[PDB]
Design a protein around this nucleic acid. Structure first.
Ligand SMILES: [Mg+2]
Ligand SMILES: [Zn+2]
Ligand SMILES: [Zn+2]
Ligand SMILES: [Zn+2]
Lengths: 109, 80, 46, 303, 235, 205, 144, 151, 147, 574
RNA sequence: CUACACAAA
DNA sequence: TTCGCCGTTGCGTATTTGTGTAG
DNA sequence: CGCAACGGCGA
């Protein structure tokens, strides 16, 4: 006789992955930030300036959005952009890490 | 009492200040969360040290601005 | 629709070519009305 | 078609006899609105207006169902980091729009060499001011670009019903406009003859065209001069050909070398700003942009 | 126009003061059209003979907008009374009408006024606004009725009629003084809808050499595509 | 007619596949009378790797395309000769493509001879020079090394590419087998021609 | 001959109030008077003999089924047929279709009231030929 | 001068010797696919959608998107349920969101379907947010920069 | 004076009973919510609502917005926090204040993850589970940069 | 223990069996009573262990106050097994594929090996399998005929001897099936047919059946399950009493009506436009949003929307108080709800509680980490939306301009902005919501601003321009001749043309009051700020009017050279 | 909440 | 024996707004 | 109202 076990018992969750960072000279993605990427960088920075308060902006701004926009424009943003290229099925997450402070900023205005 | 490797994803409510000293803050947070409580068939006495971690990814599914970071760490546990 | 009148319909494909619907009222507006349907099927049967 | 005889057998309205032959019986209105239509003319006009209202009423539901189905069939198409379009990981396009460009960053410019004959191609674009084989190969490149454009779009004409060849194309950068603006803002005037300057300008335009497919990758691989994929080389074909047409020697005689350097960097900047963004839901954009003219196709059905 | 001619404000009923009607608008002033039709021999005309200037005036009447005279609004042009009703049943002997006692209560409304109540009802003529409580029903479980509307109202009529079981209920009538506001829809008899976009004082409105000035300024661009020549001829 | 076009374009197909003929090209009258009498016309060609490709052109009314027994017998006898037999190309009328008896015969003969490729095609696939059709962009097979380097640069798996049937007319004229890659130069009204690479999947039928 | 023009008013009739309320009354009456009283008479003739009951016994059985549980539901049923307009209403543990269609008298103005009382309703897809054709100005409309 | 026929018989026209067989244009996508292949069928889809669009049509890249979506598998798939089943059989949530959620759910349950969360409908139906747009690329904190600057 | 003579005269005009004071609506971040989905109620009559429909989500997705889909559809809607075990894929029981850390499935080997979801999606998954369809959420694997 | 941040990567769908229900269930339903006083009856279908729908009690299971409680399932041990309503067709397919005596696959299993796995079982059940001889036990397979009355009753017409296939019999038949048969039939291990018969069903969480009509069905099923004897056993051809037969049929029909009826079912909430998916998941009802009639405002920029002040005091912007913005946020806090611009709520960091400003007289202290909800002010970004949202520009971000007139309650916009939304001012209503989060505000400003939709994503061309009054006004201004003569104005009127342009006015110092300026001169003075080259015939010049009229030569060829309108009129073409 | 009706774009 | 046919079932038929009415 | 599986019975 057969009595079906629960689905959870036959469920193996997943293999944890290792971050494979593509070397800088082997990156093939754009060195210019997309409008999506620049917008997300400014949004994350502004929300973090809403929860924190520390910035490297000599000029004082009364809005976190202004501080974050100037940090992105003045190449002082403390964030990095990670572009996940491939998910190898041996357990490898292949990414390209891009520095926004060295990237081309889109028009955004 | 023996060393056991644990896997966890933390939550980082101030990612800017956390990243000023990632190792120290990570050890403090791990000791705070997993101090003398059962976790995965083990009592874990104290954190020996982190053996592998992740970049502090910013949370994507909420507008909180927080980061999480995955940390795989070693610790000594009290199995009976 | 007007009663005691025939409503021929070239309705459409379901093995029915044409139908004729007649609703008959004994002579008032409140008397029971019985409807007859006179189908003409593709098989030839009326 | 005219007003069909719907009133009775052979009758359009109670006002017109059976099998009437006059044009007014079938919806011909001899009056203007200012003159004021008669009663049957107003009935026919009301028939027309009601038909238009019904069309507007039902096209909404039909086009809405079509739009929802298209959205759900297309929404999974998202631009990835290679600017391909993929569903999850399965490729739908090798490059978005086959050129990797945002639809909001396109200008319609004319390709001058397309309709030019062999003689007028020499007269307008073959530069005879320096007895060099560099300009011979430049003119050969221009002629070959024209021939390739002609062959491709003549084939496109062949496998279509009435899709005529045109010399106007949507491109990310209007090179002619950039050259004209730099000419206008130039402090100097008619440049004196300078063989070194002309040769250097030709060489730098050739190098820029050779490195043009690197806008699709980055400046790192351009600096390292790594191989470019074939599809990326094809994606830059139209802009390469336009740059060769507009930045030819004959049209850039009065352009200084630093002015041409400014022109090339402006072109590259405008090209970089025209590429589709990573993660754009281009399937939803396509669904919206194709569903909008479906409403007008339904509305124009009665024509 | 057939559609718009039936939503036009006017004397919606001749016996309106004896009716507790809901969402009903009684417009004070009505005029016979200067160019009437036979329909006005059998039905009352709703509307006014506004002076309309077909002109471009600052681009505030484009795309079916209309510029109105603020003075024409102030004088009663299209002004009227909007009516709402509040009928609340007493269910059974458990519930009754009276001001709830805050000490006992059960479910007193937070932020509510609960004042302005006499014998359980707000008296006639009292302005009610947002959180004010109208008709205090108590079962003591609080079952009062809160106003809620963002537009203040004046209690027009209160009564306690006997339902079809010899039981009393509420049905108070609320009154709104509705002048012609910016954003109110106007239309001509030719079907030309318009939203009031700008109200100008009498000194800002254009005037003819003999002093005639419009009530509404209608864009000439509303005509050529819509072909509403009847309105033009009527003018 | 279908027979005349087939006769004039099957050798164009053979030469486009870079094959050399093993017999002499008979006149058209002899070809059609042989199809009517024997029931099929056999053409044998030699590939660059000395493999043998047999092209069977079956007549519309022949006995081999409506009785599965004769088709089984013919396939078994032709697959038992001492030849390399890189591929067997069976050409039938389009209605024969829907006959489950003949299709099942082809399936069992393929299973019994895994090394040999057996394909059954309709008449219209060889009734015209397929690569010369204006509507068909230029297909070309790329080697597994070039495909591997393309996929490695793109971080792609072969299953992530757009797919093309091995029974696709341009792929048939190319000779691409399932698992291969075909590069396509398609005209573009946005970019003035573009290059795409498609993964060849199992042939329909 | 052509088929029957489904939109022509040659073969159409407008029934309002009279016919509609009459049919509703017939349906409700057959369920709320005749059938209650039939059940009452069956009960009376079952749990009582015959040829011995007086004339008043029949009258008492008659009024038993009509002075109890009656005139408060048939009246209610007709009121429900007037108000609302949902297809089926409950009449003594059995539902019957509501054959009368009513709309609230919205007193936007006198013209709206008159037009609402002059509206002919055709209460029964959107992309068929029928859906387009039955919304058209038919050639039989003029004057009616 | 050419001949515009009613009905598509591409094969019959190629058999005819009085018309050019290499420039036969047929308005039907099925005949083009059966006779010419998937690339010619994709071009036919582009041409037919462009014909339907009219004078004021969209940019060509949207027609390209339509034609490449429908021909990505090597066969012409539709924008109906069947096309979604062919192109995204495992995307149970998207197919449920389109139509017939109970039938799709039943088939997913018996089929033991695994649904990777991608696109728009699948993340949305799980209360999540699509990984597109501003959230296509994930942001990580610059530990080196913050350590050396945000003391 | 205008250079052009202006056509001016009495044109009978009607005030249609569509009042902006009735039509206008503005709601704040709080109000009555649905018991089932946890979403705001429907419209002005219920004192809370206004719907961002399917097409609005399509438009915000085409714009690539997000973070506005997040705000509107989660923060200003029934957005909630789900807990998944990461070891069985089933919903877990987590409570920070009163300490509960468990899943009815594998107990000692519970790894509860904090998953941002909506109450509508939780109800949807509960309804698929009520129809005897087991929904197991795989959860993204943890990634580690090499030691 | 700080449940870490996670995202769902994949979702797997499986058939839930008795073991799944037993493991996942937090209670077993035993008693049919609903309530025990003010608290739900323990052991009933409303038991708090399965969630809380009221705020009077917590969940016991998770101790969450309704909003944070997602609900938990409970088991109902059924005295008689039931079939799974969702998989009746699967039960039917599995029944006419295996022998009902040993669970053997009496089917050419080797025949179905080339097929794709989902179609394998359907094809196998499409075979004859009637009167077929078995192999392991050598028995004749009866004909399984689906009952014509209900959706869940099966018969075994064995040579005319019809017998009911009760779900217990079906459970035994399916239990005899090996995993090898299920694998070779194209199903999975988790799709064994034994799962298709439910001994213990799952009582759904109270979160999905709140309010004390679907609960009536569950209560009916529970109370009718109590009637079945606990140890009822049925074998093939038992011929059980009619009473038990009616009870079993009613229980199974109750389960079928609970899951798949049409009270609305669990599965009937999913489909249709107003179902769970399309109404609750693919769309949403949202807070902090406004709607009003739109009217025209010529003095608003194309990227500006007029917001009535009453709506600006309803919708709020969440401003987290920090050192850099405390001085700017101080006026908002001090104004409160009394004067504009003010605020409505303050979130206290050290309290984790919001406080209304009207009741916040005793706080008067803003701390870093506090969240102030202030009124919408001029310059804020807002999302403007018109339905139906067909285009990418149907939702755009405009700069808020607050109309401080209390008599205005319309959403005013420039007439040239109407092309984004396909709007006009004949009664159209538009949704407007002001982003309050920092992330949404950043992205509204940087990504969804209406400057990004000036060029159509559809046609790649411009969307906005002069419409109606402005098109004919441009023509009138730039036309060469008026009926009064040359189209010239003196210096005062040339200056007055720029009064409301709202940019830096040009210089007229070189023009005397007596000087006359053409319309093209002032147009060029405007267009010089952004010099462009334009050369095209105007819409004014048509060949259908050429035989008539007298077209001025300077009007029928519009030319702009570096911002100078050399000649020609400006109209719809330009 | 489930109809239904009247309306708006 | 492999397919057409044919009832027979389900599924689906623009979006967002208001007001009622009743159950 | 239409569309499409479907699955059982005629070929
Ligand atoms: Mg409008
Ligand atoms: Zn678990
Ligand atoms: Zn709970
Ligand atoms: Zn057996």
């Amino acid at each position: 006789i057969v009595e079906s076990p629960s689905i959870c018992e036959g469920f193996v969750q997943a293999s944890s992955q290792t971050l494979v960072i593509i070397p800088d000279n082997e990156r093939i993605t754009s060195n210019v930030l997309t409008t999506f990427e620049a917008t997300r960088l400014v949004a994350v920075r502004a929300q973090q300036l809403a929860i924190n308060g520390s910035t490297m902006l000599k000029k004082k701004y009364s809005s976190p959005i202004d501080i974050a926009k100037q940090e992105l424009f003045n190449r002082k943003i403390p964030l990095l952009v990670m572009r996940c290229i491939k998910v190898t099925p041996e357990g490898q997450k292949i990414v390209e890490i891009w520095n926004p402070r060295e990237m081309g900023i889109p028009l955004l205005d | 009492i023996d060393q056991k490797i644990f896997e966890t994803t933390l939550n980082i409510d101030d990612p800017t200040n956390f990243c000023t000293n990632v190792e120290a803050h990570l050890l403090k947070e791990l000791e705070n969360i997993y101090v003398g409580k059962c976790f995965k068939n083990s009592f874990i006495l104290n954190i020996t040290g982190v053996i592998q971690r992740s970049p502090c990814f910013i949370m994507r599914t909420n507008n909180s601005g927080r980061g999480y970071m995955h940390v795989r760490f070693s610790a000594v546990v009290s199995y009976l | 629709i007007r009663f005691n009148t025939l409503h021929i319909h070239y309705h459409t494909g379901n093995n029915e070519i044409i139908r004729g619907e007649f609703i008959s009222q004994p002579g008032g507006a409140f008397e029971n009305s019985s409807q007859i349907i006179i189908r003409y099927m593709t098989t030839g049967a009326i | 078609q005219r007003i069909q005889p719907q009133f009775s057998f052979g009758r359009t309205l109670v006002y017109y006899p059976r099998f009437a032959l006059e044009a007014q019986a079938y919806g011909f209105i001899c009056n203007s609105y200012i003159a004021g239509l008669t009663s049957p003319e107003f009935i026919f006009g009301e028939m027309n207006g009601r038909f238009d209202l019904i069309n507007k009423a039902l096209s909404t539901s039909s086009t809405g169902y079509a739009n929802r189905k298209a959205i759900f069939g297309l929404q999974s198409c998202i631009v990835d980091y290679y600017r391909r379009v993929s569903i999850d990981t399965r490729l739908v396009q090798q490059l978005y729009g086959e050129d990797g460009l945002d639809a909001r960053q396109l200008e319609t410019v004319r390709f001058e060499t397309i309709m030019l004959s062999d003689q007028e191609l020499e007269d307008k674009f073959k530069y005879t001011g320096i007895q060099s084989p560099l300009f011979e190969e430049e003119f050969s490149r221009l002629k070959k670009d024209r021939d390739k454009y002609r062959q491709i779009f003549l084939n496109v004409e062949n496998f279509n019903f009435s899709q005529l060849l045109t010399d106007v194309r949507q491109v990310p950068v209007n090179v002619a406009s950039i050259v004209k603006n730099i000419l206008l803002s130039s402090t100097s005037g008619v440049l004196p003859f300078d063989e070194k300057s002309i040769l250097q300008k030709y060489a730098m335009v050739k190098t820029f065209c050779k490195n043009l497919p690197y806008v699709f990758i980055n400046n790192i691989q351009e600096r390292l001069q790594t191989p470019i994929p074939v599809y990326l080389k094809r994606a830059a074909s139209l802009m390469r050909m336009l740059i060769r047409i507009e930045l030819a020697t004959v049209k850039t005689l009065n352009i200084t070398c630093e002015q041409m350097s400014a022109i090339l960097d402006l072109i590259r900047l405008q090209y970089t700003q025209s590429l589709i963004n990573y993660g754009e839901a281009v399937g939803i954009l396509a669904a919206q942009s194709v569903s909008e003219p479906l409403t007008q196709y339904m509305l124009d059905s009665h024509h | 126009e057939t559609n718009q001619g039936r939503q036009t404000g006017g004397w919606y009923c001749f016996s309106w003061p004896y009716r507790v009607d809901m969402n009903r608008f009684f417009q004070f002033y009505n005029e016979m059209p200067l160019v009437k039709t036979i329909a006005h021999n059998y039905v009352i005309p709703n509307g006014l003979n506004t002076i309309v200037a077909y002109m471009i005036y600052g681009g505030y009447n484009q795309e079916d907008s209309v510029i109105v005279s603020q003075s024409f609004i102030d004088r009663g042009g299209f002004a009227g009374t909007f009516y709402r009703e509040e009928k609340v049943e007493l269910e059974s002997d458990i519930e009754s009408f009276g001001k709830p006692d805050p000490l006992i209560t059960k479910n007193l409304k937070p932020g509510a006024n609960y004042e302005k109540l006499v014998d359980g009802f707000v008296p006639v003529g009292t302005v009610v606004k947002k959180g004010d409580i109208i008709i205090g029903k108590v079962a003591y479980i609080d079952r009062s009725v809160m106003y809620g509307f963002d537009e203040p109202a004046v209690v027009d009529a209160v009564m306690r009629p006997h339902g079809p079981n010899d039981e009393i209920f509420g049905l108070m009538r609320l009154r709104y003084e509705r002048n012609l506001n910016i954003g109110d829809k106007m239309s001509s008899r030719s079907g030309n809808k318009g939203i009031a976009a700008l109200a100008l004082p009498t000194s800002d409105m254009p005037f003819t050499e003999d002093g005639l000035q419009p009530d509404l300024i209608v864009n000439p661009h509303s005509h050529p595509s819509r072909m509403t020549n009847g309105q033009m001829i009527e003018t | 007619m279908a027979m005349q076009k087939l006769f004039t374009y099957i050798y164009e197909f053979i030469e486009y596949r870079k094959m050399v003929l093993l017999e002499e090209k008979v006149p058209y009258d002899k070809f059609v009378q042989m199809v009517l009498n024997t029931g099929f016309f056999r053409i044998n060609a030699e590939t660059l790797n000395h493999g043998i490709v047999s092209v069977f052109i079956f007549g519309a009314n022949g006995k081999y395309v409506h009785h599965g027994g004769d088709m089984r017998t013919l396939l078994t006898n032709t697959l038992n000769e001492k030849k390399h037999y890189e591929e067997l190309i069976l050409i039938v009328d389009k209605p024969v493509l829907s006959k489950k008896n003949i299709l099942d015969i082809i399936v069992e003969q393929r299973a019994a001879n895994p090394t040999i490729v057996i394909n059954i095609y309709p008449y219209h696939l060889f009734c015209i020079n397929i690569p010369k059709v204006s509507a068909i962009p230029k297909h070309k097979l790329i080697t597994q090394e070039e495909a591997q380097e393309f996929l490695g640069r793109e971080y792609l798996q072969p299953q992530d590419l757009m797919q093309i049937s091995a029974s696709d007319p341009p792929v048939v004229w190319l000779g691409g087998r399932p698992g291969d890659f075909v590069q396509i130069e398609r005209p573009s009204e946005t970019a003035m021609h573009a290059v795409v690479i498609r993964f060849i999947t199992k042939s329909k039928i | 001959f052509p088929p029957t023009d489904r939109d022509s008013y040659r073969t159409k009739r407008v029934h309002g109030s009279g016919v509609s309320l009459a049919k509703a009354f017939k349906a409700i009456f057959n369920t709320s008077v005749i059938a209650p009283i039939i059940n009452g008479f069956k009960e009376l003739l079952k749990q009582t003999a015959f040829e011995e009951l007086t004339q008043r016994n029949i009258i008492e059985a008659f009024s038993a089924a009509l002075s109890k549980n009656t005139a408060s539901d048939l009246n209610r049923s007709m009121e429900q047929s007037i108000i609302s307009g949902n297809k089926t209403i409950m009449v003594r543990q059995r539902p019957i279709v509501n054959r009368v269609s009513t709309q609230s008298l919205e007193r936007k103005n006198l013209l709206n009231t008159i037009s609402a009382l002059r509206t002919v309703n055709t209460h029964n897809s959107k992309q068929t030929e029928r859906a387009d054709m039955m919304r058209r100005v038919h050639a039989s409309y003029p004057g009616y | 001068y050419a001949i515009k026929t009613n009905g598509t018989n591409i094969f019959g026209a190629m058999l005819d010797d009085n018309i050019d067989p290499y420039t036969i244009v047929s308005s039907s996508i099925g005949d083009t696919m059966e006779l010419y292949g998937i690339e010619a069928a994709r071009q036919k889809i582009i041409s037919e959608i462009r014909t339907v669009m009219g004078d004021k049509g969209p940019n060509h890249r949207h027609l390209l998107m339509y034609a490449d979506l429908m021909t990505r598998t090597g066969q012409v798939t539709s924008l109906e349920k069947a096309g979604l089943n062919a192109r995204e059989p495992s995307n149970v949530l998207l197919r449920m969101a389109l139509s017939s959620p109970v039938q799709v759910l039943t088939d997913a349950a018996v089929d033991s379907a695994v649904n990777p969360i991608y696109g728009i409908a699948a993340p949305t139906l799980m209360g999540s947010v699509p990984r597109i747009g501003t959230m296509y690329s994930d942001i990580i904190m610059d530990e080196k920069y913050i350590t050396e600057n945000y003391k | 004076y205008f250079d052009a003579a202006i056509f001016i005269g009495p044109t009978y005009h009607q005030r249609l009973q569509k009042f902006v004071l009735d039509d206008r609506y503005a709601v704040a971040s709080y109000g009555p919510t649905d018991a089932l989905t946890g979403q705001p109620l429907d419209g002005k009559r219920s004192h809370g609502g206004l719907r961002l429909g399917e097409m609005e989500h399509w438009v915000l997705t085409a714009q690539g917005a997000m973070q506005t889909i997040i705000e509107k559809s989660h923060d200003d809607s029934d957005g909630c926090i789900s807990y998944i075990c990461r070891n069985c894929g089933e919903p877990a029981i987590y409570n920070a204040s009163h300490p509960i850390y468990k899943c009815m499935n594998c107990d000692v080997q519970a790894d509860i993850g904090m998953v941002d979801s909506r109450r509508s999606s939780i109800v949807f998954q509960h309804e698929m589970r009520a129809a005897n369809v087991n929904i197991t959420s795989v959860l993204s694997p943890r990634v580690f940069q090499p030691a | 223990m700080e449940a870490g941040y996670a995202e769902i990567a994949a979702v797997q769908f499986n058939i839930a069996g008795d073991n799944d229900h037993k493991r996942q269930g937090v209670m077993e339903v035993t008693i049919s009573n609903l309530f025990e006083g003010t608290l739900p009856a323990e052991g009933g279908i409303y038991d708090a262990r399965m969630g809380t729908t009221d705020h009077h009690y917590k969940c016991i299971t998770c101790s969450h106050q309704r909003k944070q409680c997602m609900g938990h399932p409970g088991i109902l041990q059924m005295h008689a097994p039931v079939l799974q309503p969702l998989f009746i067709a699967e039960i039917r397919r599995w029944l006419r594929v295996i022998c009902l005596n040993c669970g053997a696959p009496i089917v050419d299993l080797k025949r179905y090996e080339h097929l794709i796995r989902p179609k394998r079982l359907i094809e196998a059940a499409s075979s004859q399998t009637e009167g077929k001889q078995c192999y392991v036990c050598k028995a004749v397979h009866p004909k399984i005929v689906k009952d014509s009355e209900d959706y869940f009753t099966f018969w075994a017409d064995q040579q005319g001897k019809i017998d009911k296939l009760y779900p217990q019999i079906i459970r035994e038949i399916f239990s005899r099936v090996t995993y090898d048969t299920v694998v070779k039939l194209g199903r999975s291990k988790n799709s064994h047919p034994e799962k298709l018969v439910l001994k213990a069903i799952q009582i759904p969480p109270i979160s999905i059946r709140p309010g004390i009509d679907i609960n009536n069905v569950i209560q009916y099923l529970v109370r009718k399950n109590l009637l079945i004897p606990k140890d009822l056993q049925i074998v093939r051809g038992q011929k059980i009493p009619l009473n038990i037969d009616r009870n079993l049929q009613t229980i199974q029909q109750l389960y079928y009506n609970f899951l798949l009826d049409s009270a609305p079912s669990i599965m009937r909430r999913l489909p249709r436009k107003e179902g769970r998916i399309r109404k609750s998941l693919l769309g949403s009802q949202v807070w902090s949003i406004s709607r009003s009639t739109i009217c025209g405002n010529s003095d608003l920029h194309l990227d500006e929307v007029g917001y009535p002040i009453s709506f600006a005091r309803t919708l709020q912007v969440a401003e987290t108080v920090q050192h850099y913005n405390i001085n700017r946020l101080m006026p908002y806090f001090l104004n409160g709800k009394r004067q504009y611009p003010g605020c409505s709520r303050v979130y206290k960091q050290i309290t984790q509680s919001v406080h209304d400003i009207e009741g916040l007289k005793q706080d008067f202290r803003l701390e870093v980490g506090d969240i102030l909800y202030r009124d919408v002010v001029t310059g804020d970004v807002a999302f403007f939306n018109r339905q139906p949202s067909l285009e990418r520009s149907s939702i755009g971000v405009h700069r808020i301009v607050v109309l401080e007139n209390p008599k205005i309650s319309t959403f005013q916009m420039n007439v040239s902005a109407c092309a984004w939304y396909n709007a006009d001012f004949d009664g159209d209503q538009m949704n407007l919501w002001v982003p309050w989060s920092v992330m949404s505000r950043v992205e509204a400003e940087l990504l969804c601003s209406v400057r990004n939709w000036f060029i159509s994503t559809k046609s790649s061309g411009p969307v906005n321009g002069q419409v109606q009054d402005s098109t004919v006004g441009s023509f009138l201004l730039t036309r060469t001749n008026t009926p009064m003569g040359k189209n010239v104005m003196n210096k005062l009127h040339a200056m007055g043309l720029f009064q409301t342009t709202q940019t830096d006015p040009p210089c007229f110092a070189n023009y005397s009051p007596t000087d006359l300026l053409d319309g093209k001169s002032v147009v060029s003075m405007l267009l010089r700020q952004t010099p462009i080259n334009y050369q095209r015939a105007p819409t004014w010049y048509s060949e259908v009017y050429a035989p008539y009229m007298h077209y001025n030569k300077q009007d029928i060829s519009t030319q702009i050279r570096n911002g100078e309108l050399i000649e020609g009129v400006l109209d719809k073409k330009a």
